Write an enzyme that holds these catalytic residues in place. Structure first.
Site, PDB file in Angstrom:
ATOM      1  N   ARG A 187     -24.742  15.050  -0.858  1.00 26.22           N
ATOM      2  CA  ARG A 187     -24.850  13.607  -0.928  1.00 26.22           C
ATOM      3  C   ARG A 187     -26.018  13.123  -0.087  1.00 26.22           C
ATOM      4  O   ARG A 187     -26.876  12.368  -0.517  1.00 26.22           O
ATOM      5  CB  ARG A 187     -23.570  12.942  -0.489  1.00 26.22           C
ATOM      6  N   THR A 232     -16.643  -3.678  -5.662  1.00 24.29           N
ATOM      7  CA  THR A 232     -16.457  -3.682  -4.235  1.00 24.29           C
ATOM      8  C   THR A 232     -17.840  -3.675  -3.538  1.00 24.29           C
ATOM      9  O   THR A 232     -18.070  -4.399  -2.593  1.00 24.29           O
ATOM     10  CB  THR A 232     -15.662  -2.447  -3.854  1.00 24.29           C
ATOM     11  N   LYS A 234       0.875  -1.177   0.000  1.00 24.50           N
ATOM     12  CA  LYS A 234       0.000   0.000   0.000  1.00 24.50           C
ATOM     13  C   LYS A 234       0.901   1.211   0.000  1.00 24.50           C
ATOM     14  O   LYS A 234       1.987   1.175   0.581  1.00 24.50           O
ATOM     15  CB  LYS A 234      -0.894   0.083   1.242  1.00 24.50           C
ATOM     16  N   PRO A 278      -5.867   2.579  -7.211  1.00 24.24           N
ATOM     17  CA  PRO A 278      -6.505   3.686  -6.556  1.00 24.24           C
ATOM     18  C   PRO A 278      -6.872   3.365  -5.105  1.00 24.24           C
ATOM     19  O   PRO A 278      -6.984   2.212  -4.713  1.00 24.24           O
ATOM     20  CB  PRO A 278      -7.821   3.942  -7.339  1.00 24.24           C
ATOM     21  N   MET A 304     -14.088   6.243   6.618  1.00 21.23           N
ATOM     22  CA  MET A 304     -12.727   5.977   7.078  1.00 21.23           C
ATOM     23  C   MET A 304     -12.607   4.717   7.901  1.00 21.23           C
ATOM     24  O   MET A 304     -13.623   4.200   8.386  1.00 21.23           O
ATOM     25  CB  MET A 304     -12.233   7.153   7.957  1.00 21.23           C
ATOM     26  N   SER A 320     -13.341   0.072  -9.815  1.00 24.37           N
ATOM     27  CA  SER A 320     -13.653  -1.179  -9.167  1.00 24.37           C
ATOM     28  C   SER A 320     -14.750  -0.983  -8.096  1.00 24.37           C
ATOM     29  O   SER A 320     -15.108  -1.908  -7.361  1.00 24.37           O
ATOM     30  CB  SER A 320     -12.396  -1.835  -8.612  1.00 24.37           C
ATOM     31  N   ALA A 337     -17.556  -1.398   3.676  1.00 18.38           N
ATOM     32  CA  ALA A 337     -16.427  -1.365   2.763  1.00 18.38           C
ATOM     33  C   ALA A 337     -15.139  -0.823   3.337  1.00 18.38           C
ATOM     34  O   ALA A 337     -14.050  -1.058   2.791  1.00 18.38           O
ATOM     35  CB  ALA A 337     -16.780  -0.494   1.569  1.00 18.38           C
ATOM     36  N   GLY A 380     -21.051   6.864   4.913  1.00 18.68           N
ATOM     37  CA  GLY A 380     -20.228   7.192   3.776  1.00 18.68           C
ATOM     38  C   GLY A 380     -21.014   6.828   2.533  1.00 18.68           C
ATOM     39  O   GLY A 380     -21.321   5.658   2.280  1.00 18.68           O
ATOM     40  N   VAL A 387     -18.646   3.586  -3.441  1.00 20.69           N
ATOM     41  CA  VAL A 387     -18.992   2.257  -2.948  1.00 20.69           C
ATOM     42  C   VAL A 387     -20.228   2.285  -2.034  1.00 20.69           C
ATOM     43  O   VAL A 387     -21.184   1.545  -2.239  1.00 20.69           O
ATOM     44  CB  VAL A 387     -17.818   1.614  -2.245  1.00 20.69           C
TER      45      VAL A 387
HETATM   46  O1  LIG Z   1      -8.772  -2.845  -2.784  1.00 21.48           O
HETATM   47  C1  LIG Z   1      -8.105  -2.018  -2.193  1.00 21.48           C
HETATM   48  O2  LIG Z   1      -8.287  -1.657  -0.950  1.00 21.48           O
HETATM   49  C2  LIG Z   1      -6.926  -1.390  -2.892  1.00 21.48           C
HETATM   50  O3  LIG Z   1      -5.927  -1.099  -2.264  1.00 21.48           O
HETATM   51  C3  LIG Z   1      -6.989  -1.170  -4.351  1.00 21.48           C
HETATM   52  C4  LIG Z   1      -6.075  -2.137  -5.058  1.00 21.48           C
HETATM   53  C5  LIG Z   1      -6.391  -3.494  -5.031  1.00 21.48           C
HETATM   54  C6  LIG Z   1      -5.595  -4.442  -5.675  1.00 21.48           C
HETATM   55  C7  LIG Z   1      -4.432  -4.021  -6.338  1.00 21.48           C
HETATM   56  C8  LIG Z   1      -4.094  -2.666  -6.370  1.00 21.48           C
HETATM   57  C9  LIG Z   1      -4.910  -1.736  -5.715  1.00 21.48           C
END
Ligand SMILES: O=C(O)C(=O)Cc1ccccc1
Ligand SMILES: NC(=O)c1ccc[n+]([C@@H]2O[C@H](COP(=O)([O-])OP(=O)(O)OC[C@H]3O[C@@H](n4cnc5c(N)ncnc54)[C@H](O)[C@@H]3O)[C@@H](O)[C@H]2O)c1
Ligand SMILES: NC(=O)c1ccc[n+]([C@@H]2O[C@H](COP(=O)([O-])OP(=O)(O)OC[C@H]3O[C@@H](n4cnc5c(N)ncnc54)[C@H](O)[C@@H]3O)[C@@H](O)[C@H]2O)c1
Ligand SMILES: O=C(O)C(=O)Cc1ccccc1
Ligand SMILES: [K+]
Ligand code: NA
Ligand code: NA
Lengths: 347, 350
Positions: A210, A153, A78, A117, A240, A149, A260, A182, A186
């Site tokens: 929102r 998710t 990360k 991301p 968060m 994504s 999430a 939030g 997502v």
């Molecule tokens: O899914 C996540 O929390 C991420 O960090 C995004 C991601 C997931 C898999 C590869 C690169 C980034």
């Protein structure tokens, strides 16, 4: 904390400081056991570097667990970009240099880390990074990536929530009150999905508009200061991380936690309290895995959109497995999920 | 503090902590401008992790300049392993585990960083690192490496010393008094070289055996407490770095400073002070470059031993250029050296 910042046990920490922008860069590679470390780039403001370091390691460890338990062939990493000002306040030119520098850092790792991301970073940012380094997932469809994504998710979290609700003995979402914290990309989709399933949605977001929109849709607003004390069947943290401290765990008035957010639980004690209190928690790293399944599945495994959706749906099954271990061995869902992760990773 | 240590302008900092051994690992890449970053692995105990980071940054920065001013096509980097106990106490298993971990770290850099020996690391250790990663210089001869660079460093330092003494108007080494602090791999050869050139040697070392050996050879021992207060023509720091603090620079009683130690000067003011006092200092990053010339020359450039030897001897000429700029532009030798480094690097890219 000092320990989480300095005495972190992951494989590697990469740091850099750029005086010009005042930005600090952290990349933590938790594990490359199952393959190159992968995980998104979170860009935010931190009080102290220690916090940025801490977060990066916690997020990186979560990624390792997430890939492990999700049967994806990648390690966990990360990036955290400690901003010198609020994201929104960063000028274009500054942001661009920041991304450039971040890409150079990733590039030095020559494929040992693949980004994507996260908070405050998007597909356009991935594309920009890609202008300098190859190791980026989540580029726009136009640039060759899998794009957003978010929906994936959301699907994973929703299925997670359904599996949890069922295991907790609540039957289905129909007639349940779900508090979504939030209303982002997502959380918004999650709410839509649960509302469609028959749940009554309580929503909270720092963005007024929102919230008003949600309300416009029939949902009910929850004041920020009331979020953690508002009775609901399911509490869905989609903002968060670190929301569930011990004190929060002691006072939450719900029967299921499924959302999430990354690193939802502040400490192990919190996890035990929830368990003790009869609040069934769907482990974050299991529940929110849809994002990783989307990016890795699509970009690494060449999986189609349909397949990735399918796999995101299977998160429910993975949770059922998590719950079984929890019940059998008498351990918390988080412990159980760690156990499953290890088993699936063939440790 | 860590925060301040982290406010570093280098290209990249790599760190790792191994709970099992209690060791900390730091790799700092100062620059990859001229080529992959390269620099040795120093293993020692530190008070605070932050000191390890700071040390690594200063050492990495010196490597950048060293390569640049020495006409070597490589960037500057350095590794620091913060030991959990005195190096001597570390059992072989733990040491072996530490090296394996270090090697893994280096390996992730995939060639953007090439390591070598430094304090507490040797060719055997390089071989061990090489069991795991390719990016290692200084492997044993048997292993395909160029082995020890200590003699080459000594040659360069010696030539540096000669050039500096000459520039300072002292003539040749013959009859001059040289204080060698640290009778190690480099210091020992340096002492031999200087003594052969007719210098009278004063020596100091924490190793009492080492001192006795030197005395046996006709040299004069100096007590540790006295090292920085001993009058001499030449002060040759060949042990730890940061010996010349502002305070020491004010009182140092010598005409020339020329040694093998890395990062000899503790603070900038020290540099200014020596210059102002007329004590001619041969910048460490230029003077001790024989090690790098040996490793890179041998292992990267394809140079013969004789050629390496020649290049090391040429450190005196580089120093002559340095002093020349110092005199014309009225800057310290360190500043003139940085200037020269920058010139060469450009030229090297042009
Ligand atoms: O899914 C996540 O929390 C991420 O960090 C995004 C991601 C997931 C898999 C590869 C690169 C980034
Ligand atoms: O992608 P993705 O959907 O994870 O993230 P996202 O960035 O798209 O969504 C984050 C969301 O959480 C909200 N948020 C931030 N702090 C909050 C708080 N204290 N309470 C409630 N909402 C808050 C934001 O306004 C936003 O809707
Ligand atoms: N750039 C590099 O790769 C590099 C590599 C190795 C050494 N070096 C530098 O050159 C120096 C000399 O290296 P070497 O190969 O000869 O090291 P070495 O370990 O062989 O010898 C250093 C000597 O100094 C002695 N010493 C330690 N503290 C002392 C003190 N307070 N007073 C006197 N002597 C003391 C040690 O006992 C030893 O005899 C190193 O310490 C380092 O600064 C540079
Ligand atoms: O002599 C040095 O400066 C070193 O640090 C040893 C070394 C030299 C060149 C590359 C790698 C390590
Ligand atoms: K129901
Ligand atoms: Na570890
Ligand atoms: Na409603």
């Amino acid at each position: 904390s000092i320990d989480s910042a300095l005495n972190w046990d992951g494989e590697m920490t990469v740091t850099r400081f750029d005086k010009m922008t005042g930005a600090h860069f952290v990349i933590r590679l938790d594990s490359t056991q199952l393959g190159p470390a992968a995980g998104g780039t979170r860009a935010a403001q931190y009080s102290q570097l220690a916090d940025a370091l801490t977060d990066a390691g916690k997020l990186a460890g979560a990624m390792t667990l997430k890939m492990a338990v999700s049967n994806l062939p990648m390690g966990g990493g990360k990036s955290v970009i400690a901003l010198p000002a609020p994201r929104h306040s960063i000028d274009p030119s500054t942001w661009a240099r920041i991304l450039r520098i971040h890409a150079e850092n990733i590039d030095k790792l020559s494929g040992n880390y693949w980004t994507g991301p996260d908070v405050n970073t998007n597909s356009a940012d991935m594309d920009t990074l890609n202008d300098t380094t190859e190791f980026v997932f989540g580029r726009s469809l136009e640039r060759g990536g899998a794009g957003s994504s978010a929906f994936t998710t959301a699907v994973g979290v929703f299925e997670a929530m359904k599996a949890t609700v069922a295991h907790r003995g609540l039957g289905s979402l129909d007639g349940l009150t779900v508090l979504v914290q939030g209303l982002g990309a997502v959380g918004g989709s999650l709410a839509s999905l649960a509302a469609e399933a028959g749940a009554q949605l309580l929503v909270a977001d720092t963005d007024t508009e929102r919230v008003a929109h949600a309300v416009a849709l029939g949902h009910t607003a929850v004041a920020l200061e009331d979020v953690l004390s508002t009775p609901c069947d399911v509490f869905a943290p989609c903002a968060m991380g670190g929301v569930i401290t011990t004190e929060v765990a002691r006072t939450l008035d719900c029967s299921v936690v499924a959302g999430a957010a990354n690193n939802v639980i502040a400490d192990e004690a919190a996890s035990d309290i929830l368990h003790a209190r009869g609040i069934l928690y769907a482990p974050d790293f299991v529940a929110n895995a849809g994002g990783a399944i989307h990016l890795v599945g699509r970009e690494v495994l060449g999986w189609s959109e349909s397949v990735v959706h399918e796999r995101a749906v299977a998160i429910g099954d993975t949770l059922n497995q998590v719950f079984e271990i929890s019940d059998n061995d008498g351990v918390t869902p988080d412990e159980a999920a760690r156990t499953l992760a290890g088993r699936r990773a063939r440790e």
